[PDB]
Ligand binder design. Structure first.
Ligand SMILES: [Mg+2]
Ligand SMILES: [Zn+2]
Ligand SMILES: [Zn+2]
Ligand SMILES: [Zn+2]
Ligand SMILES: [Zn+2]
Lengths: 165, 97, 118, 144, 171, 167, 147, 107
């Protein structure tokens, strides 16, 4: 689901004829690194979105009904004594939220994310400055170090005719 | 008592349109429901004590229309919405006769 | 429940048979002032229809019941329907009929000028 | 705790608490008995299935069976779907134990009140830490 | 802000007012249903211009209610606020949540998060006020405020003010 | 006419000159033709409302200092119009307090002076309403004026607005 | 007597021509849904029972049943049954802590009347008590009766 | 007009449509033995001009789709050589009004 590895559904014909549709796990380097870039990029994007939503003023919330009411619609809910905002359902004085008191905390969390992910961005800079080969299962078979002796998995590829996916 | 299809059709042949409307609405089910001008859907939250009308998604609060339909009609439209059909109801014409 | 031998025919019950046999412009645009047909070239009948008479009588009776001013003198008549009939009889109903043509155009025919021949 | 969401139906003119209220079912009206003012009209008095939320809880499920035109390959795959569910394993075993209670009571020809009492006793004594090592036939016998 | 706009309203006349002065009754109900009436689409409508010639066409009788529906077109002065607009006003109420400033017919509530931090609430004063190192904001005080938020219902409009920008505040 | 939902639009903001689709620069009047959007400053609005009220008082009959002005317009208000005049009374009081210019000739001088600029009606009404002093203060009060009026022209036009300020 | 109508003699009707007895039986059960959820036959009281019907309960006895021989009319409670409810709720406004039960009574048909002919109290196959009330009225021939 | 004897080859039916305004109408002799129009069930069909069609649409306040239709395979339509959009005034004997004129546009 994060595409750090990908699967191949190749089945072979072992000499004992007890063949099963075994699965091969390998790594697709360009799709994997593109997934890393997209994930960390959009993570930075909605971290900016979260700190921006914190950066608008806090508004209020009603503890009885557990519903929020921002400053824009709290002034439709202020009382006749012009002192307290009363809830539309509970008729309870609105209490203060904390969207703006934690803006510095969110900025600190953003900073602590960035200095931790500095090696990631440096690696992305290097692999975007240089050129990568788009590997597949067939390419990845070339540099295999074999894992076990009595392996029921045969790494020889079987080409087929008629598949036009 | 059932005021069925062909009783309605006898009233149609008579030409009593207002009596037909009174039978189907003021004698069976007269339901007031709010729609908006953006989407014809019945998803308009109405707070009549606070005089506050608002449609989510469209985010419009000044384009709310009041219609009287049978509750069977409202149930039909909501069943279509459940079955993923949008029976958008509009209060103005768009094409010529 | 009930169990009666008297065959009362189930009316509005045709879906049994349905399931038994299931297999086998140039002159006017938008809403402009041109939609109002002028009085000199009105092509509809100068006679009030039965439906026009029925709706004028109903509308006028509803207004009289909801305390509209009455533009005829009363002869002791109290029912709004016959008060509206008298107002129609000596032409004191200040309403007009907007007869819609199928193309969307309409003609305005006042109750005073419409002939009540029925 | 939580929103009120309760309608307290009082006459707005008599101002009497508690209000003397008559629910005229035949007229579809709710009236204040002191002055006759209609507070709420168009009273609401088959299409679903009965379910008691004391015996099997708030469980809602439907089975899959043969229709008018039904190929048997599709039913067999869908029957394994409800069986191969991990969320309601506790529900499946408590329904199996209710089925054992009912068949034991039927083999004994015990009345329906005995069946219901035994089922509720098993449901109340189910999943209790003090009752984990005892044999299921003993649970059935003690519930009966 | 104050504007002049062509406006149209569907007004309903009860049949009891179907007299020879139906146009006068229409104009009077136009007055006491439009003058001072708040709409969120066109702002606070204050006064009706050109009362001598108000466009009243033929009024359709409602088929069930029996009342007449007139689509009256008229000229009127309106007051519609907008986000980001600087207006002057006078304070009419104060609290710990903030204070309302009266501009035109509308009360703009300025929250306690939208003043400079030197300015603080003082409820011990009579009336309660807001006091800072250089100025005091009390009831019946001239004050310039920027509107940075407006909500508009069908019949109500509410605005949010702030004086945290420089060259705002008391005048 | 197309029937798109078109539910996406920018928020109405005064700095971006977005006042809504029905406060555009062109307005189709009741006579059918297009007209420039009539935006009034505070003194202009006060004079238009007062002219409307005295014209209505004339129609009903046929059918200056702050203290005397407030009572004169209060008697005019109660003589002319009937119910639901809380909002109109507050507008009258607000305009007689914050009315920069007294009479028709001075205010019409303000309209012709601001029409010599050829500027937006909203912007010139804001200039005629706000009692600004300097060009930079005008720019920070009205962000709409950024890259629209040169600084020397702005400071001079506010200088004769300060001269036209009276009482 | 046109279109198959008939003229019957009112004097013959008075003397008993085509007079009939009509008996209707109302069967009710008290059932045990759970442990404390059990129906019971009793005469309910408005102070401690919710959703009482607007008809009279005065013809009921201590067992929640009317003795035979007693005249009953439409919407009159002939079988009095109560079921326990959850305490401390808020429904219909007229709810307090005294309302431990709610009414599940069987009244007479709203259009009918008659005399309670017979009341039979017994047990079903499950052993639950259940009652059957036969109410007897007299249909005297009148305009619109079919012959 | 091409009056053939028994059948037309489909390899010539593709080239029956030629360069406009030249049109080709193929007719079978067996179908052409008897004039269909002389039957009393066939009323009088008169092709209208463009001005007559325009006047008809204006006076009856009509559109293209609101007229009664006649298919462009109808025997009378092929007899008159009707193209798409042409209107025929159809005069028939009416037992309530003597003479009745209907109108059918070719689709
Ligand atoms: Mg018969
Ligand atoms: Zn609340
Ligand atoms: Zn919507
Ligand atoms: Zn709701
Ligand atoms: Zn009352």
């Amino acid at each position: 689901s994060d595409r750090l590895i990908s699967i191949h559904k190749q089945r072979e014909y072992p000499p004992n004829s007890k063949s099963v549709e075994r699965v091969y796990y390998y790594v697709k380097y360009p799709h994997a690194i593109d997934a890393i870039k997209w994930k960390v990029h959009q993570v930075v994007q909605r971290l900016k979105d979260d700190l921006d939503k914190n950066s608008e003023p806090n508004g209020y919330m009603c503890p009885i009904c557990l519903t929020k009411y921002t400053q824009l619609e709290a002034v439709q809910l202020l009382n006749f004594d012009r002192t307290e905002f009363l809830c539309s359902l509970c008729d309870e004085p609105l209490v203060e939220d904390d969207s703006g008191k934690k803006n510095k905390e969110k900025q600190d969390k953003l900073n602590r994310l960035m200095d931790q992910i500095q090696p990631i961005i440096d690696s992305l800079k290097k692999i975007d400055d240089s050129r990568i080969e788009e590997n597949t299962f067939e390419i990845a078979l070339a540099r295999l170090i074999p894992p076990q002796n009595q392996s029921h998995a045969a790494y020889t590829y079987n080409p087929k005719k008629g598949s036009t996916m | 008592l059932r005021f069925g299809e062909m009783e309605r059709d006898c009233m149609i042949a008579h030409g009593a349109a207002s009596f037909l409307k009174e039978r189907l609405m003021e004698a069976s089910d007269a339901f007031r429901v709010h729609i908006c001008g953006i989407c014809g859907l019945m998803t308009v939250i109405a707070k009549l004590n606070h005089n506050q009308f608002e449609c989510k998604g469209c985010d419009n609060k000044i384009d709310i229309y009041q219609i009287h339909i049978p509750y069977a009609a409202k149930l039909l439209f909501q069943e279509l919405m459940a079955m993923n059909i949008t029976p958008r109801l509009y209060t103005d014409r768009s094409r010529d006769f | 429940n009930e169990n009666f031998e008297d065959f009362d025919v189930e009316h509005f019950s045709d879906e049994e048979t349905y399931e038994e046999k299931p297999q086998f412009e140039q002159i006017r645009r938008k809403t402009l002032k041109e939609k109002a047909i002028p009085k000199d070239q009105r092509a509809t009948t100068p006679y009030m229809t039965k439906y026009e008479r029925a709706r004028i009588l109903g509308t006028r009776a509803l207004q009289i019941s909801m305390n509209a001013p009455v533009f005829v003198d009363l002869e002791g008549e109290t029912d709004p329907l016959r008060i509206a009939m008298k107002e129609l009889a000596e032409k004191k109903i200040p309403l007009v009929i907007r007869r819609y043509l199928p193309d969307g155009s309409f003609e305005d025919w006042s109750v005073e000028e419409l002939i009540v021949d029925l | 705790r939580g929103p009120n969401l309760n309608i307290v139906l009082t006459c707005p003119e008599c101002k009497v608490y508690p209000p003397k209220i008559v629910e005229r079912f035949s007229e579809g009206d709710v009236v204040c008995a002191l002055c006759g003012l209609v507070l709420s009209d168009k009273l609401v008095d088959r299409v679903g299935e009965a379910s008691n939320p004391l015996l099997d809880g708030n469980n809602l499920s439907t089975r899959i069976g043969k229709g008018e035109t039904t190929d048997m390959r599709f039913t067999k795959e869908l029957n394994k779907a409800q069986g191969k569910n991990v969320m309601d394993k506790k529900d499946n075993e408590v329904q199996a134990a209710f089925a054992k209670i009912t068949m034991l009571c039927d083999a004994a020809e015990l009345p329906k009140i005995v069946k219901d009492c035994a089922k509720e006793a098993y449901k109340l004594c189910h999943d209790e830490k003090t009752l984990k090592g005892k044999s299921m036939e003993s649970i059935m016998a003690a519930s009966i | 802000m104050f504007f002049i706009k062509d406006l149209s309203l569907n007004i309903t006349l009860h049949p009891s007012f179907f007299g020879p002065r139906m146009k006068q009754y229409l104009k009077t109900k136009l007055l006491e249903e439009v003058e001072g009436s708040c709409t969120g689409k066109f702002g606070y409508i204050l006064c009706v211009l050109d009362y001598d010639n108000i466009d009243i066409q033929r009024g359709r009788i409602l088929p069930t209610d029996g009342s007449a529906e007139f689509n009256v077109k008229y000229r009127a002065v309106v007051f519609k606020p907008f986000k980001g607009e600087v207006v002057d006003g006078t304070v009419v109420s104060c609290s710990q949540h903030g204070f309302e400033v009266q501009v035109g017919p509308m009360k703009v509530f300025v929250t306690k998060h939208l003043m400079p931090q030197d300015l603080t609430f003082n409820a011990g004063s009579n009336p309660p006020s807001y006091q800072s190192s250089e100025d005091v904001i009390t009831i019946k005080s001239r004050i310039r405020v920027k509107i940075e938020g407006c909500i508009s219902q069908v019949s109500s409009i509410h605005a949010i003010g702030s004086i945290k920008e420089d060259y705002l505040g008391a005048i | 006419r197309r029937r798109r939902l078109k539910k996406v639009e920018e928020e109405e903001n005064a700095a971006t000159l977005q006042l809504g689709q029905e406060f555009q620069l062109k307005q189709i009047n009741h006579q059918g033709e297009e007209e420039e959007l009539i935006a009034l400053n505070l003194s202009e609005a006060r004079l238009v409302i007062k002219e409307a009220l005295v014209e209505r008082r004339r129609a009903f009959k046929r059918s200056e200092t702050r203290e005397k002005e407030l009572e004169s317009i209060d008697v005019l208000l109660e003589q002319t119009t009937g119910g639901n005049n809380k909002d109109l009374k507050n507008t009258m009081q607000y305009l007689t307090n914050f009315s920069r210019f007294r009479d028709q000739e001075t205010v019409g001088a303000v309209i012709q002076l601001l029409k010599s600029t050829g500027l937006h009606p909203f912007e010139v009404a804001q200039l005629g309403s706000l009692a600004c002093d300097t060009a930079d203060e005008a720019k920070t009060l009205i962000p709409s004026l950024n890259n629209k009026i040169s600084d020397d022209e702005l400071e001079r036009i506010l200088k004769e607005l300060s001269n036209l300020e009276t009482l | 007597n046109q279109e198959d109508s008939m003229i019957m003699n009112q004097s013959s009707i008075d003397r008993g021509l085509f007079r009939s007895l009509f008996f209707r039986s109302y069967m009710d059960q008290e059932k045990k849904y759970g442990m404390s959820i059990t129906e019971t036959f009793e005469k309910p009281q408005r102070t401690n029972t919710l959703r009482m019907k607007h008809g009279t309960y005065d013809k009921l006895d201590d067992d929640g049943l009317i003795a035979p021989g007693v005249r009953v009319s439409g919407e009159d409670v002939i079988i009095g049954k109560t079921t326990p409810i959850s305490p401390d709720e808020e429904e219909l406004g007229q709810r307090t802590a005294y309302h431990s039960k709610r009414d599940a009574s069987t009244p007479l048909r709203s259009t009918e009347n008659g005399i309670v002919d017979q009341v039979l109290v017994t047990t079903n196959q499950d052993g639950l008590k259940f009652v059957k009330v036969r109410v007897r009225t007299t249909k005297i021939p009148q305009i619109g009766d079919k012959f | 007009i091409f009056v053939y004897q028994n059948n037309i080859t489909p390899s010539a039916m593709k080239l029956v449509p030629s360069i406009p305004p030249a049109t080709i109408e193929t007719f079978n002799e067996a179908a052409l033995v008897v004039n269909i129009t002389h039957h009393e069930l066939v009323p009088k069909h008169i092709r209208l001009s463009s001005d007559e069609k325009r006047e008809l649409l204006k006076r009856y306040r009509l559109k293209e789709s609101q007229l009664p239709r006649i298919q462009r395979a109808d025997p009378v339509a092929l007899y008159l050589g009707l193209k798409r959009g042409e209107v025929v005034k159809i005069i028939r004997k009416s037992e309530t009004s003597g003479r009745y004129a209907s109108y059918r546009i070719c689709m």
